[PDB]
Amino acid sequence: ESKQSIMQRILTVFVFTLLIATVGLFIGQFVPVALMLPLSILEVAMIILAFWMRRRKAVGYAFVYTFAFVSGITLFPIVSHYASIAGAYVVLEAFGSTFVIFAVLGTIGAKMKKDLSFLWSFLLVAVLALAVVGIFNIFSPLNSAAMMAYSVIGTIVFSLYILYELNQIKHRHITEDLIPVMALSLYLDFINLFINLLRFFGILSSDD
Template sequence: MYQEAVQAPLAAVLRAFAVSLAFAVLGMIAGMFVPPALFLPLVAIEIGMLLFAFFLRRKKAISYTFLYTFTFISGITMYPAIYYYLQSMGADLVLLGVGTTFTVFTGLALYATTTKRDLTFLRGMLFAALLALIVISIYNIFVPINSSGMLAFSFIGVLVFSGFVLYDFNRMKQYGMTLDEIPLMALSLYLNFINLLLSILRIFNILSERD
């Protein structure tokens, strides 16, 4: 009975995650037609929604409408980065980055849901590493990091968000979830995937510029 109770919500989380990615793709398409002046306000809205979801985390109370609205806006704000990588290193490498991300994400998810180990002990280390990445990102805005530093930053990003994929999937396996938690878990997986993707694309771009 316990396994059935865990597996049913996990399948629902994966469906919500897949729909979230679809909304993000629609957002990227819409981003082609959004005036540049609107991107900054949309980023502010995106950050506000993310903080709202974070503060509601204990209540586990975000809705599917909130989830899909956020991922659509996220797709719009991500369009300039994807466009830059398409122009900088070409569609082939971008597609390779997407494929690599899907492969890594799937492999980590399979391991986390099949291992007998409880990986939830990673939480504290992962959140500390995430805060460090955020601080470095803010620092980079004012004092740009050179390509070697950014390459190291990107590899650390891959490790951190890979760790979050392991943590989230293993937590679902170990402790299950309620139906109300599904949108929040799907949002967490979406953020892991997108940040993993952007870190991998950044690595590919830096390496391609050195060739």
């Protein structure tokens, strides 16, 4: 099949994962808080299996849809936290902003003729740096000044990742078994961008 059909199937599953995550977000309000950490460890195991492990056969559809539901449940602690200090509409602002960046930068990358595979180093090194401060935030919560810079840098990094992601979908040879894992990558890019925008707008609309 042509790439125009493969991209439509990747974006269709990506929309399905967003809907499933929304269901998991609504169900996560009833899940007890003690279950949030074990569910988080389950996600890190799935992320390692999908991307970090050398797999002969690619990940399947049931795997990605399950991750999207579980990821939505563990997203309730942070969503309900910023809805408390900034209002329920600030969550929709960050969600809407995540879509316009995904649409604008995702389209420019998918229609870009130049192969952006050379900046894979800078995106990896930036995300690994953001991963280090993420661990520091868990054990030592960040103040307003540091958290704001962490959110803006994270918003810029994961915005450029969406531009790079769909640009690589256009240039790299995408087979049919990679459709779930490619839509799973777009979901992780979407969620991390959404968390940073939720963090960005939350600090902006509060009395920190």
